[PDB]
Every structure is written in C-alpha cells, then in structure tokens.
Design a protein around this ligand. Structure first.
Ligand SMILES: [Ca+2]
Ligand SMILES: [Ca+2]
Ligand SMILES: [Ca+2]
Ligand SMILES: [Ca+2]
Ligand SMILES: [Ca+2]
Ligand SMILES: [Ca+2]
Ligand SMILES: [Mn+3]
Ligand SMILES: [Mn+3]
Ligand SMILES: [Mn+3]
Ligand SMILES: [Mn+3]
Ligand SMILES: [Mn+3]
Ligand SMILES: [Mn+3]
Ligand SMILES: [Mn+3]
Ligand SMILES: [Mn+3]
Ligand SMILES: [Mn+3]
Ligand SMILES: [Mn+3]
Ligand SMILES: [Mn+3]
Ligand SMILES: [Mn+3]
Ligand SMILES: [O-]
Ligand SMILES: [O-]
Ligand SMILES: [O-]
Ligand SMILES: [O-]
Ligand SMILES: [O-]
Ligand SMILES: [O-]
Ligand SMILES: [O-]
Ligand SMILES: [O-]
Ligand SMILES: [O-]
Ligand SMILES: [O-]
Ligand SMILES: [O-]
Ligand SMILES: [O-]
Ligand SMILES: [O-]
Ligand SMILES: [O-]
Ligand SMILES: [O-]
Ligand SMILES: [O-]
Ligand SMILES: [O-]
Ligand SMILES: [O-]
Lengths: 266, 266, 266, 266, 266, 266
C-alpha cells in the first residue's frame, strides 16, 4: 500500500512561466521513456518478483521514487502554464504572444484548463506499450538501465532548452537521481549476469545452433563491421566474419487456402 | 537501397500445421520486442549516425538481417496456418477442432485468409512507439542489447510451447543469431562507454547535483536494497544509503487560471 | 435506419476564415469528449437497451442529434480553412501569414486538402476507447451527463478563443443544446436512481463488506478531507473518517514459475 | 512525494489458481474504467487543483488509495496464474487443460512469465486517453462518480464469474470502497454545484441561445421521450417538446481549394 | 441533419444465438474495413466536396446507408449474445459451454452487459486512422471501391462461418449492397478518370522525371514480373523492364549535430 | 532474404536545411499512406501469395523498392534538420528563428537528436492498422493502386510546399515511380478482374439477394445521384434508382439479459 505527503521530493518551481517549455516537459511526463514509464515498469517488475529480496526491494524503492518525479514534473508544468496566452484578449494585450501561442499544445488550455496532460508534447497518450516486465530480471535490469539512460539523455537536452534557473535546478536533481538509477541497475544487472550468464536467458547454450552464434554477418556493403572480426566477445569467444552471408532456407511453397476463403491470387 | 532474394536466410518450415503456435509466433513478428521492432530500430539508428563507420555499418548489417527474420517468421506463420479450421464444415469433419478454433486469432482467417498479420497474438497492431533511435549510441546500443535480450527470452519460451522439430529448428537458428546480436551490441556498448563515460550522457557530471548521485533511497519498507550500501558502483564510487528519504521541495501553490477557463475548483 | 437532409441543424458559417480556430474545433469533432463520442455512445446505448422506451428513445433522439452536430462542426472547419496558407506562394501575397502557418495542423492541407479530419487538434485519431455503453443505464446516464458537461466546458472555452460572431453564433446554439442534454440526462439519471438505488449497481449492498463502505481513508497528509467527517452521504448514512488507514492484507508471496519460463530473478 | 509498505491494503489471495479469472481481472487493472484510470485521474486532478483544500485533499487521498488497489489486483493476477498451463507437457499431463489454455491470454506466459500485464483482457494497452482532468471540478467530480460507477458495475459482474471465496473476499472489499468513493464524490459534486450552478460551466447562461435550452428534440420516431414533456428539470424550468425538429442552418457551400492542392472533385 | 426510424433497413435477426459468431461480426462493426469505416469515410468525403453534385450526393447517400448497416450489425450482435455463457452457473447448466466461453470476447459480458462493442474481434478499438478523405475524389473513389471490396470479401467469409439461415439472410443483403456500392464507385471513378486522367493526380505529367515513369524495376530475384515487359499500360505506353536497378543517389553524409544534443556516435 | 547497399536509389539531398519541410516529409515516412505502409503492405501480400508468379514477384519487387524510398525519406529529413534551432542559444544568435521553432516537431530535437522519427508530422506513430493483406489479390491490388494514388497526391502537394530544387528533384523521382506503381498495379488488377470477375469476390453472385444489387438508394435529399439511373454498370447491367428507400427489417426486440449482469435499463 502507499502513503502520500503533499511535500515534493525536490524543488519544482520555475522562476518564470514558459508554456513552450511546459510542452517540452510533457515528454518527461507522458513520453515513451518518461517518468510514468519508469514508475509503471519498476513497480510491475517489483510486484512480479518471487526472487532475491535485494532486487525486489530495489525495484519497489525505485518505482515509488519515480512517482515522486511524476508529481514534480506535473507540478512544474502547472507552474510553467501560469498566465499562458490562449485567446484574442491575450493578443490584444501583447501581439508578440502569437508566436508563443503557435508553439503551444492547444489542448493545454482547451482540454486541461492550463494544467498538465498525460500525453507527450505532440498530444500522443502515454500507453502501457512502453512498459516492460518479463519475469526475467537479467533482461529487465537491462531494460531499466536503458530507461534511465534515454531519460537522462532527454533531461540533459531539456537543460539546454531553457535558461530558467528554477527549471534547471529541478533538472540538476533529476540528472543526479538518474545517475544513481543507472548505476544501481547496472550493479544489479552485473550481479544477475554473474549468476545466470551474460546471454539472456543463460540456460539455452546447448539448444541453439552454436555454429552461427559468433559470426558477424555482413548484409550491408559498408566495411566498418569488419573491425569486430577477431575481437573477443564478452563470453570469451572471438567473432568471425562472413562478408557474403548466404541464404540457406530455400524458397517457400505454402499450400493455397480453402476455397471458402476466396483467396484469388492468380 | 535494398535487393531481395526469394531464398530464406534459414529453414522456416514446420513438420505440421498448428494454428495456435501460429498465433503465438505473431509475438515475434508484430510484438513489442519482435523482429519488426529490431529491423526498424537498427535501420533508423544506422541512417541517423554521422559517427564511426564501425557502428553505423554494424547497425545497417543487423537491421537488414532482421528483415530476413521478419520474412522467416511470416513464412513460418503461413505454413502453420495451412488447413486451419474456421467454420462449421471443419467441425463437421472433426468436432475436436472446436477447442483449436477457440484459441485461434479469428482475424487470421477472416481478415487475412489464413496468412500472417502484423499484429501481436492479441491483435494489437505493431507500432512505432516500440522503436528507439535517439541520436546517442551509448544509450541506443544499450537499447539494442535489451531488444535482443527480450526477444531471445521470448524465443526461448516459444521453444517450450511446441514439440514440432521443424519449428524448433528455426527457433534454434534465431537463438543463435540473437546470441551474436546480444554479443556484438555489448561490444559496441563497451567501446562507446570507454570513449564517452559509463553514465549517459557522459558530459554532464559537472552540472548534476552530485550530492544525490550515489545515494540509494529507501522508499519501500523492505530491507533488501540495504545490501548495496557500501558496494562500489561501476564509476568507482561507493553507494550510500538513506533509510528515510526526506521531502525537500515544499508544498506547491500554483496560481489559479484566468476566469475565461472556467476552472471552478471551490 | 437513418435519412439525411442537406440542410444543417443550425448555422455553421464563420464571418471570416481562421485556420487556427479550425484546428481548435478539431477537439469538438475528433476529441475525447467531442460530438463523435456523444454520437457513438448514445446510439450504442440506445441500440443496447431492452428497457423503458422513455430512456431508449431519448438515447436515439440525442445520438441522432449529435450526428447533426458532427456535420455542423465538419462544415465550420471547412469554411474556416478557406484560403488557408500552405506554401511559399501564400507568403509572397501576404508574408504576415508565417505565424498562422506555424500554428496550423500540417495535415489539414497535406492530407485532407483543407478539409476536416477526424482527429483532435494534435492529430490523435478519434477512437472507440472514448465510448461507453455498459448495459446499465444508471451508470451510463451518469456517463452521458459527464460527456455533455466536459463538452460544454470545452465549448465555453472555445467561445473565448475567437471574436468571430459567426463562430460564436454556432457556439451559442451548441451551449444551449448541451444545457438541454445535461438536464435531460440528469432527469433520467434521477429517475433510474429512484428505481434502482443511488449506488451502482443497486443490488449488491448485502454482498459488500459494509464495515468499509462509509469510511473516508486519509492517504495523503493534508487535512482537508476531514471536513467530510460527520456529513450525511446521499444514502442517509454519515461518513466516518480514518486518519491512519491500515494495511490489512499482509505481504504477498507468490510461487516462482516453471523453469521453462526462464524467470531468472535472483 | 510517496512512500510504500509491502503490506497490501486488504487480502488479495485466491483459494485456488484460475488463469481465466486472471484474464478477466486484467479489466480492473488495465481497462478503460479500471483502477489505473482511477489512480491517474484523481492524482492528476488533485495536483491540478488550486481550489478548496477539502476537494484537493480528497482527490489526493483517493488517488493514493487507488494505487493500493492497482497493487492488490496485480498481486491477485499473479496468484491466479500460478501453475498455469502453457505448453505441450501440460497437456500430456492433463488433456482437459486444452480448453483452459484456449481461453487464456497467450501473452501472460510468453511475454510476462505468468505475471500481470498493464493491458485489458484483450491485450489492449491501458492508455491516457481514458483519463480526465479538465481544471473544472464540477465536471470532473461527475466524471469521478462515473469512474466509480462503471468500475463497481464491473466488479459486481466479476463476482458472478467465480465461486472462489478468496477472490470474492477481495471483490467484497472493492465493492465497499467503490461505494464510499461514489458517495464522497457525489457529496463533493453537490457542494460544488451549489457554489457554481448545476449546468457546467455555471457562468454561461446569459451567453447561450436560451430558446433552445429546454427543448427535447425528437429525431427518432419512437414516442418514449415525449414522457419528459412538461417535467421540471433540475434548474426548475420545464421541458418543452418538439416532435419535428427543423433544420435552420441552410445548405453549405464551401469554396473549392487552390489548384496547388489538386482537389479534383468533378 | 439526420432523422432516425426504429425500423431496420433489412432483417438482422438470427435463428439462434451464437456468441462466437457475435465476436466474428465485430469485425464488420469495429474493424479496419467495416461499416463504421465506410460510414465515416463517405460522410467525410461528401461533406468535403465542393464539386459536382452527382458525386457529392452519392457519397452522402451511401454514407447514410452505411449508418443503417452499422445499426443492423449492432442489432445482430445483440441477438447473437442472447443467453451467452459467462459464469459458473452457466457451466452448471451445461458443462459443454466451456469451449464456447473460451472462444468469446471476455468484454462482451464484463464491460458491455452482453451487447456490442465498437471494437474488432480482438478488442482493438475502431479508430479514425482507418478513414480516408483527401479532397481528391479520383483518389478517394478508388479508396471507396477498395473499402467495399475488402468488406464484401469479409462478408463472403462470414457466410461460410455460420449455418444460421437468419444470419445468412442478413449477409445476403449486405453482399448485394456491397455489389451496388462497388459498381457505383467504380462508375464515378471511371468518369473522374476521364475528366482528370488515369494517374492521380492527373496534372503533374510535365513535372515528374518521365524516364522512370514506365520502368518495371526488378528488386527481387524472381522472373515473374518480366511478364509485364512490353505489355501496354492503361495510359497507352508500354512497360519497359530493368533487371538490375541501379543505385543513383550516392552515399549520404549528414553533418554531426550541435554538442548540446549529446549525439555521441563514436 | 535481403541485402543492402549504402547508395541511395536516387538523390535525397536538399539544397538547404528547412526543419518545417522536415516535419511535413514525416507524412511520407510514418503517415497513413506513406512509404512504410507501401513497404509493409506489398511485402506481406507478396509473402502470402501462393498463386501466379507474375503477381507474387511484382509485389516483392515493389515492396523492396519501397524500402529504398523509406531510406531516401529518412535521409532527406536528416539533411533538412541540419542546424535546426532548439534552444535559447539559437534564439540569441538569431531571434527571427522563433517562428521556425514554433512550427517544428519538438520531438525531432528532444527525442531523436535532429533525426527522423517513424511518426507522422503530428507525432502519431505509424502502425500496422494502415496495412492490408487479405489473401485476395483482386481486392489487394485495388488497395495497392489506392496506396500509390494517395501517396502521389501527397507528394504532389509537397511539391508546392517548397521552392528547394534539391527537395523537388527527389519529389520528381518519387512522382515518376508512383506513376509506374499505379500503372503496374492497375494492369495486374485488370488481369485479375478478367479472371475472377469485377465484383470482389467474383464467386458469390448466386448467393447475394440479386434484387438489391443494382439499386441506387437515395438516403440524402440531394438529387445528384439520380444521374446514375439507367447508366450501365461495369458488369453490364443498368442501375435503377429508388427515391424513397424503405425500411424492411422491422423493429428489433432483443431479450433482457441475465440478472447477474445488473443491466438496469428501466
Ligand atoms: Ca557491412
Ligand atoms: Ca526498501
Ligand atoms: Ca488527507
Ligand atoms: Ca423519439
Ligand atoms: Ca523480380
Ligand atoms: Ca440523394
Ligand atoms: Mn526519475
Ligand atoms: Mn530514475
Ligand atoms: Mn532477429
Ligand atoms: Mn537479432
Ligand atoms: Mn452536441
Ligand atoms: Mn449534446
Ligand atoms: Mn478502487
Ligand atoms: Mn475507488
Ligand atoms: Mn455496407
Ligand atoms: Mn457499402
Ligand atoms: Mn514509393
Ligand atoms: Mn510506390
Ligand atoms: O527516472
Ligand atoms: O528522473
Ligand atoms: O529517477
Ligand atoms: O532473431
Ligand atoms: O536476430
Ligand atoms: O533478432
Ligand atoms: O453540442
Ligand atoms: O449536443
Ligand atoms: O453535445
Ligand atoms: O476499487
Ligand atoms: O476504490
Ligand atoms: O476504485
Ligand atoms: O454492407
Ligand atoms: O454497404
Ligand atoms: O458496406
Ligand atoms: O514513392
Ligand atoms: O513508390
Ligand atoms: O511509393
């Protein structure tokens, strides 16, 4: 179960309003790699785990922390939309506001009354297709590292899209929390690989066709990938290289369907 | 530009038909972590790169290979649907087929004439929300490792959902190529991390609030995560632990909106 | 069965063109709470009803009227897009059109030839996930009241986003029809609540855990909700208040999955 | 900010496993009117409010409670999927499992390792298009009443779809919480309506075309809606009835587009 | 404006209930090429037309007709769901219904009270991404012919998925209307091609690079398309054939982006 | 299987950057009727065909060509985004860039590092709901003609949305390839109609209710469509016309559902 305090985890107040920045920050709230994706993925994985408490608790700690980041971004967006222009009266007040209006999300005013949405900057709704929880923590720890990496890259870009010290203060905190999240998930990942294997899942080595398991196949005519030839892979074996990959499966000959289907194909 | 040969990369013909397995394999064709997601992500990333040829070509080689995997899975699905039941005639010939029909995707017969769709097993259309190409290859190589990890996990599970030796032969080839892909991407990732830093992006360490960058925060009441306290993180610094994270940002108080919005909130 | 007349229900011509207003009005056509949502929801509910003709006919009457509103908004959008700027040649005649072009939906010209789409202002397609028809009219009449309330609020907001008297004339008519629809739906709601009960569905009181049915649980640390304590609910019973809600379900321990799943969780 | 305890709010363990019921319960977790829609709507509205603490705190109390319900449902799905059949070895052990297997979501095993997804029973991803937060609490409290009414209707149906006492125990608690949530939201609604008006928004009465505000228009030829004629609406004015609604807006003719659009329409 | 009559355009009552057929028929209501797609596309195009009344009226006639088909299919689904099984009590009456239950859409009972949804058989919501209205009727008439062709193909398939004479009677009516719709749209299509040209749009012949306009390029290694060489196209010119298409565009080299983006690509 | 060459099929380099045109070109990449739709539709149909090699090979040839067009568009967008403004430093250097920035897709910079997305200009993700492969090539060849028609119309419009000769050079090539694709698909369609019939599917004529197959029904009150009366349809029979379509199916009366559903409808 959860409990809430009205106090934010860290400052989320800008020095000045900026409805364009509000739109950009929707990425961190409702976007593919944003805080809702983290919260929902880590909590889902945390609830699904039946294994080591060390990782299960780490996931519940972090998914709960991400709810605090969702709260911060939502709040920051609301502050950034204060006094945003949305009608002729604003333009009569100041005609330069037409370009600001042109760059805003029309729904921030019309649908949400100058409050945050749960969409990305282009109005695309956040959706559970962005969430991963597979039951396998070697795979999902790798996902959690990527989640924090794409997120931290976006936060770093956002840092250069504003000169507001209040906004940057919040971003500086999130950058740091994302550094910690990348590190802790890499540690868990490393511990899990040591236990189960560097290849996911680590118990299928005997089953796969080993003959194709370490060959770089050159399907494009560039020469760059040839530099991997002869390098030792993480599992201790070297890569070989095939300049001209061959088709080994033959030409398919699927049986025509039942006439009740009317599959008229010539 | 691309060129095509009708010959498959590797065998994709089952020993017998199985429309239930056909529906499961739709995961690998139109699902979140399936081969289409691979093909579109790697090609997009490769086209976007202005960097070292070694990684750009690796992406284009692999994206092109995943197109061959898409073709194989589509082909396998078509074979698996040969003679599938879809109407009263079929139940007339064999009433047991009713439980088979109940587990099939009704659109396989009705919309596609017993051929593959580009949806997952539940009819959800594949979509670009599953693709990642961010411009930063340290982050995107981590994504690519995850893409092949989740995929190989699913293929490993598919292997246990059939006893068809023809189906398994194809799966054993995919497992091996996914091993190679996981390895090559891990290699690329390690080289980029060496060049740019283990935290993504690597050039923001002076900007983040350092004080919070290595603190594990205990938001859930289990003690499992305390085990990380004092461990050395991949960047050479130790993790500290905070048993009681504090709310540091205060209580928000945003300004009420203009009356033209009619934000009646008591 | 339906029949159509080319004449519109009410005026839908603006005094002047305005492609920015055309984009906003997309919300009333293809948005979450727009006219298509009302049309599809009320017709579905009316077709589903096997009950009192009073409500079934009210639903078909209103659903049919909303089709007229869809027609009117589609028409208004077309008039508002007359002579809209979309390329260099327009800028040459009037270079002040650059900001207008920047705030337009690029698809209005490119995809639709300066005609309405069935998307919202951000290009998000209208979809059936916005529709509700549950088989229970006590619940669905509450939904219908909400549909008209959110719609009338957006129309009220649109009223302040233009000074065009022709646009406003149409909005004034819509406001009035939405007043009527809110009222007719509240009347039907009221009657049904009187027949079946105020809690939906009204025949489960003996089944629920009554001990928890009138307790306000304080999950967030603000004190505002305490004001409800001791007030009389709509069912005649008073609210009680719990300042410190308790976790009564214990800690879950679900069984680890079959090894064939490769759920490696440490 | 939020904190979490591993203890569930209320019991969420079934007496026996049942993967078909697990699939139905996905409706309460990832469905249109499910607990996720509840959690996200109330928290969004709560963070958005700048109004009375009485309602802001209520929204945050309830949004936070709904996160516990999400946690319970996810856990219950987990228990219900224990030992679920997913491959040929299971059918060899017990042939009768084939129909169970046919009615399951194939992704529960293949993608999630026999854990919950954030999809509905048909694999459709939960998405933010289900959420409402408009800035107007008279409208949004009406939405909140509907959200709890549709949810409680669904939980009531689920009660008749199982005979498991452990499952029913959880449903009996949810029923009771949905009773309190419907009531408290109705209470808040009534207070807001007294302050602002029964029509949303309450301040447009002098703007709308009053002549059409209380007329029931008969667009379908059934006779049932005439029963409203002469009844007093909630605002104290009687409904009038129009048996033959008139088209007052004429026939629109919009101007053909510029030749550069190639709008060839004969 | 529209008017409704409770009478259906044609019979839509099955001889017996069949909830599996109900689910299949969801394709005709909420699917990609179903009647809602026809209805919204033809009405959108008809409202957009500024051209000849012959086509504009045809579109409005047919779009209106399609609403009658939507109503018929919704009604049919309702009848087919009469007495459908959804709980243990049903299995107590007739254990053989377990398979029927496994094949049903779980939401028909749970969400809709055994009534139609606006989704396809797999629960995917109908959406406006299925609709086309471009402003060019040479293009859109071709789309309309396709719409009716895919629909009639699906109806033909449904015909073989039931032996219920009542259901087939309805299907026989739809096949005929779809024959008429295909013919009328092909006739309008032919007339518009005569006026504007067979290539869409017809006024760009002098602009395109004519050298590549009649060349069949052989990108896959089969010899089948060589049969087109020397055949005469519908514009009177013969197809030529290139066995080895050449890459004429060079190797792209885009400029590395600004460091503020952190595009670390090695 | 596929192979790739770094060389583009044709020139894809603009003379100058233009982030607004970049946004418009996303329609051709990730939009409903764009090159991705073509690629996936033709490959899917090609893989599904079990009929004549002439058509199967044609589909695979063209599907493979469309991948080159995807590559060209992705490349052209990357060049058009070179040096695009995204933050305050840009505006400090040149304040006139504000209107450009206002019209851009915010995700081009923030998510993709000034590279292409797989979304349309409005950020709506490309999805498989755009693709058709039905198993019947008479219907699907009609689809393919439409796909190239809508695409070519959009390309023709883009031509008028820029004065850049480099961009225009690319569009001139696409226009020609789309002329060829329209023609080749119309040729195949014609051959298939000649073999199977002009109505799709061609083998259901004795089943449909013939009485209704050639009747134009006047559902909207315009007189335009009467002009089709007596004209000869493509199947050699004349159209009749019905000025007042009659409702022949009566008034539906479906049975009230089981009480366990709580369908309270009055
Ligand atoms: Ca290569
Ligand atoms: Ca903890
Ligand atoms: Ca409180
Ligand atoms: Ca009526
Ligand atoms: Ca060929
Ligand atoms: Ca007419
Ligand atoms: Mn975070
Ligand atoms: Mn984080
Ligand atoms: Mn692969
Ligand atoms: Mn791979
Ligand atoms: Mn209306
Ligand atoms: Mn209304
Ligand atoms: Mn709840
Ligand atoms: Mn609740
Ligand atoms: Mn029809
Ligand atoms: Mn039709
Ligand atoms: Mn092309
Ligand atoms: Mn083409
Ligand atoms: O995060
Ligand atoms: O974060
Ligand atoms: O974070
Ligand atoms: O693969
Ligand atoms: O692969
Ligand atoms: O792969
Ligand atoms: O309205
Ligand atoms: O309305
Ligand atoms: O409305
Ligand atoms: O609940
Ligand atoms: O609840
Ligand atoms: O709830
Ligand atoms: O039809
Ligand atoms: O039709
Ligand atoms: O149709
Ligand atoms: O093209
Ligand atoms: O093309
Ligand atoms: O194309």
């Amino acid at each position: 179960m959860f409990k809430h305090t009205r106090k934010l985890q860290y400052n989320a107040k800008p020095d000045r309003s900026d409805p364009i920045m509000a739109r950009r920050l929707q990425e961190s709230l409702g976007g593919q790699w944003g805080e809702t994706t983290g919260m929902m993925s880590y909590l889902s994985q945390g609830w699904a785990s039946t294994g080591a408490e060390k990782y299960k608790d780490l996931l519940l700690d972090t998914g709960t922390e991400e709810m605090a980041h969702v709260e911060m971004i939502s709040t920051m967006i609301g502050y950034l939309l204060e006094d945003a222009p949305f009608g002729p009266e604003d333009l009569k007040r100041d005609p330069s506001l037409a370009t600001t209006m042109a760059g805003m999300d029309p729904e921030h005013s019309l649908v949400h009354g100058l409050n945050a949405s749960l969409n990305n900057p282009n109005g695309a709704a956040w959706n559970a297709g962005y969430v991963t929880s597979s039951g396998n923590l070697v795979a999902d720890m790798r996902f959690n590292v990527v989640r924090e990496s794409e997120a931290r890259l976006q936060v770093s870009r956002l840092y250069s899209m504003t000169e507001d010290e209040g906004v940057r203060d919040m971003l500086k905190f999130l950058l740091a929390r994302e550094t910690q999240h990348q590190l802790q998930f890499m540690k868990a990942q490393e511990e899990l690989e040591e236990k189960y294997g560097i290849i996911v899942p680590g118990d299928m080595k005997e089953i796969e066709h080993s003959e194709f398991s370490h060959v770089l196949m050159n399907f494009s005519d560039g020469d760059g990938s040839k530099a991997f030839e002869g390098q030792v892979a993480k599992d201790g074996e070297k890569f070989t290289y095939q300049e001209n990959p061959e088709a080994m499966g033959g030409i398919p000959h699927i049986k025509p369907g039942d006439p009740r289907l009317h599959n008229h194909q010539g």
